[PDB]
Amino acid sequence: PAIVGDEHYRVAQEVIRILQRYKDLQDIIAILGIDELSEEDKQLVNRARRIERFLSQNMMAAEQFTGQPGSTVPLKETIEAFDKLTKGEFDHLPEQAFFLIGGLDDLAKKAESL
Amino acid sequence: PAIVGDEHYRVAQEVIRILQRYKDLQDIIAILGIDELSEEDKQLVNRARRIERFLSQNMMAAEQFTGQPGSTVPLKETIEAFDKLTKGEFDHLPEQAFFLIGGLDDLAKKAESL
Amino acid sequence: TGIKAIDAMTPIGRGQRQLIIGDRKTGKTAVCVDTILNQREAWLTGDPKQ
Amino acid sequence: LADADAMHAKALADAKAESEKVTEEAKQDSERIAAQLSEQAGSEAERIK
Amino acid sequence: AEREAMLAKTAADNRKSAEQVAAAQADYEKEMAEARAQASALRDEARAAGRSVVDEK
Amino acid sequence: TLRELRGRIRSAGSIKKITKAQELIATSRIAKAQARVEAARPYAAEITNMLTELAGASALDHPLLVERKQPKRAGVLVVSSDRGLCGAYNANVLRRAEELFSLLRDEGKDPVLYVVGRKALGYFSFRQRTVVESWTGFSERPTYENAREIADTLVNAFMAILGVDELHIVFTEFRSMLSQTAVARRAAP
Amino acid sequence: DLNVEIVAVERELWSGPATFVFTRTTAGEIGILPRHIPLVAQLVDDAMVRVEREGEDDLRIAVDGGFLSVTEETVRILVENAQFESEIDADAAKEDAASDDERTAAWGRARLRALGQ
Amino acid sequence: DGQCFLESDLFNQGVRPAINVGVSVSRVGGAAQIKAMKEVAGSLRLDLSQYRELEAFAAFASDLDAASKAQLDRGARLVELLKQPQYSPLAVEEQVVAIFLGTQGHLDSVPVEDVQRFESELLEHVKASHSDIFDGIRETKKLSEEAEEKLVSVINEFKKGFQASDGSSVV
Numbered sequence A, B: 001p002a003i004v005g006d007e008h009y010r011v012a013q014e015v016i017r018i019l020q021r022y023k024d025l026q027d028i029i030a031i032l033g034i035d036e037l038s039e040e041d042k043q044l045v046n047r048a049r050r051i052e053r054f055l056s057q058n059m060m061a062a063e064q065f066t067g068q069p070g071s072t073v074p075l076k077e078t079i080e081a082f083d084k085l086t087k088g089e090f091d092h093l094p095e096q097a098f099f100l101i102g103g104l105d106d107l108a109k110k111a112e113s114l
Numbered sequence C: 001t002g003i004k005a006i007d008a009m010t011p012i013g014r015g016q017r018q019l020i021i022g023d024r025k026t027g028k029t030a031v032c033v034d035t036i037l038n039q040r041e042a043w044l045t046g047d048p049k050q
Numbered sequence D: 001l002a003d004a005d006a007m008h009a010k011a012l013a014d015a016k017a018e019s020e021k022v023t024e025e026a027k028q029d030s031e032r033i034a035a036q037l038s039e040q041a042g043s044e045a046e047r048i049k
Numbered sequence E: 001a002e003r004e005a006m007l008a009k010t011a012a013d014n015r016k017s018a019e020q021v022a023a024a025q026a027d028y029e030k031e032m033a034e035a036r037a038q039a040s041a042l043r044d045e046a047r048a049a050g051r052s053v054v055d056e057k
Numbered sequence F: 001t002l003r004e005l006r007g008r009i010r011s012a013g014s015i016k017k018i019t020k021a022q023e024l025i026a027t028s029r030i031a032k033a034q035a036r037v038e039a040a041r042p043y044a045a046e047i048t049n050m051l052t053e054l055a056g057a058s059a060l061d062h063p064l065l066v067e068r069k070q071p072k073r074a075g076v077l078v079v080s081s082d083r084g085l086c087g088a089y090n091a092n093v094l095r096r097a098e099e100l101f102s103l104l105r106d107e108g109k110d111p112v113l114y115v116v117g118r119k120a121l122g123y124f125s126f127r128q129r130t131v132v133e134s135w136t137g138f139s140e141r142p143t144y145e146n147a148r149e150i151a152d153t154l155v156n157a158f159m160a161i162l163g164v165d166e167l168h169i170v171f172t173e174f175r176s177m178l179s180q181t182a183v184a185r186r187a188a189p
Numbered sequence G: 001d002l003n004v005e006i007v008a009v010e011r012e013l014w015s016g017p018a019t020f021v022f023t024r025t026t027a028g029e030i031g032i033l034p035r036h037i038p039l040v041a042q043l044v045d046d047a048m049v050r051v052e053r054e055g056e057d058d059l060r061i062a063v064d065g066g067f068l069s070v071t072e073e074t075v076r077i078l079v080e081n082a083q084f085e086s087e088i089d090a091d092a093a094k095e096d097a098a099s100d101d102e103r104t105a106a107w108g109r110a111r112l113r114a115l116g117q
Numbered sequence H: 001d002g003q004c005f006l007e008s009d010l011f012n013q014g015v016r017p018a019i020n021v022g023v024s025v026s027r028v029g030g031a032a033q034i035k036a037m038k039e040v041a042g043s044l045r046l047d048l049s050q051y052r053e054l055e056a057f058a059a060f061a062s063d064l065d066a067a068s069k070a071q072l073d074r075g076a077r078l079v080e081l082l083k084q085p086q087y088s089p090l091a092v093e094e095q096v097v098a099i100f101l102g103t104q105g106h107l108d109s110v111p112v113e114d115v116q117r118f119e120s121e122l123l124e125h126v127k128a129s130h131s132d133i134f135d136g137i138r139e140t141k142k143l144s145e146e147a148e149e150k151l152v153s154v155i156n157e158f159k160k161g162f163q164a165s166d167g168s169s170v171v
Ligand SMILES: Nc1ncnc2c1ncn2[C@@H]1O[C@H](COP(=O)(O)OP(=O)(O)OP(=O)(O)O)[C@@H](O)[C@H]1O
Pocket: A002, C023, C024, C025, C026, C027, C028, C029, C030, C031, H016, H017, H084, H085, H086
């Protein structure tokens, strides 16, 4: 919380906590099924799915294959986007909307496309 | 037994038997806890823990570190105490009662303290 | 040392060798630097006994 | 209903008065906190200089 | 009619009697908690202002 | 020494896998058991309602409603698991049963044991205490037939045959997922 | 119309509305249709229950020593074990009815009665 | 003459400094520690080691005796109290007051989530308004009876005007 901003540290640690809980619940999901979870756990699993798929990015190294120009997401934009995600403000989007997108602009555009 | 007498030897060897049996169970204790053991072994584990903690003593050289004055236990008292303890006459007292107490009178005093 | 935990549980007296032992990135150089920094209140006293 | 009314009025009035007291004490504490932080700011500026 | 009305009135009366006595303590505690909260907010904002002046200076 | 350490690593890994599987199976069976507990609630509520009505109309002289003038025997139905790996479940239940026995003896009553679950049988056998009758094999998944059998036995023992002047049931209340508590209810009189 | 709740000690078997109910209490047969006076009556050890649903044919249920109850809002049948007539095994009921035990014979006879015997 | 064993397991989970109170010890200490610290933190090391041992037992036990719960709560509050930022060395008198808060039970009414803020705010209040306590501790190296009573009064007064993170009062 010294080298990086305090808000950055809070967002990163919240994302890590959510992903850790999601990986803990992987064992229950893959065996007992998703239905067995509680409402809170189901909400957290959806949120973690979206956060984890939102860590993906249309890397410039993929431009040679898809022709889509790679995205450079400024640190502030990443911090704010993941603050929104951990708060659930995008939990109503489809999971596919978060695959290979750089930042909230691409998120909104892909959401509109779907 | 020829040197320290029959009673001292019997008490010492019964204490060693209890402690060795406790050591043999260490993996099961570590994994599943005392709950899984048989009753003949669960009672033994309880009095083994009590014997192990009762072998502790508030050494006079330890005053400078902890502040409690050091206690001296005459041989007859320790032989009688361990004969009583192995037989289970104190397995109703909590473990902390025996910890760094140095004698039967102090044992009862600290049991009252708890 | 200026650290609550060390000055309370494991006090360091002048003339003592107190081993700061721990794995990598466990805060060993941040406990000795804090100790050095905390000596400034004594340094400004100007008294060699402090 | 008269006394309960009297008790409720007294409770409201006493709560307002002791809330004024609480807020005055808290304002004094706030002033002293601000003074301490300003003094610390001055000391830090002096050390930086 | 008036007899019945009086029964009803005394009923609601004792109802308020228990109530208003309960609500007196409830509202005293509510206002006291609100006063403590305003005091804490004042101290917190003053501390924030002090740290802000520290940062600025 | 290295061979022993590697063998123990393999053994501990196998134990970890087995225990994790048991944990997940227990997570499923907790939901199953809680759903079954809730499924029986309507019957209990309705039968309690009509029993209250009948008591309002009854003479309230049934033996189950009147204490024996000099009580000597108090049956105790200790409900315990029939398989291990349950942590302190059995220990808690049996400690509460011992507390109940001490309470009974301080009041001058003599406890007589009825037991459900093999672990409780073992605990009482080691302590040289006899059990009048014991059932097993349904603590993991009880059915109304077993409860009917237990209730018939307890009620008949209460009507008597040496008989019992009282009867309690000592079992684990499932207050919540995080907490369970060993309790004793006097089921008669 | 009646709100008939048929409850087994294990589960809430059935809770559909009905226009009429028929069953043999220990003191006699009873036919219940709405606004009946509040009632509670033990069923015979071999009793069977008929519920005339507002839709298709009435359901016949084998009931083991249940207690019938009626109140302005519902009609309850609290049973140790209840089976829809379609779930009855004829051979099993026949074998049970021949059993020496009173309870087993009563249950088999109840199942036969519900089936159509 | 002693080792402060910093543990990675405690460091990586927020407990910084990660002092392993069970293994960490100072042989020559105790004589060097000032009198006030020796009074307030006399049993702090043993209490924290016992709490760390008890946490494993209570991490899965459904319930425990009243003594066990009291020890667990006291140890959690003490651990949160000893947690300290970096490059923020507290003077010895501030340490004395902070440890006095916990070892004497004044934190029992403060939730675990707010022990850090409670301690920091009380230290600020004592510096700003009741510096006589710090002056006494510094000048005579002892927490005198009058100073202790005044500090207890100040702690009780402050707990009236403090919010837990849940909004409830900590009195
Ligand atoms: N009390 C503390 N609170 C928060 N962060 C801390 C604290 N103490 C240390 N840290 C963090 O720990 C990080 C690593 O610790 P530090 O550099 O002191 O460890 P070290 O033992 O010297 O490591 P190494 O020699 O392996 O580099 C530092 O960047 C600092 O941010």
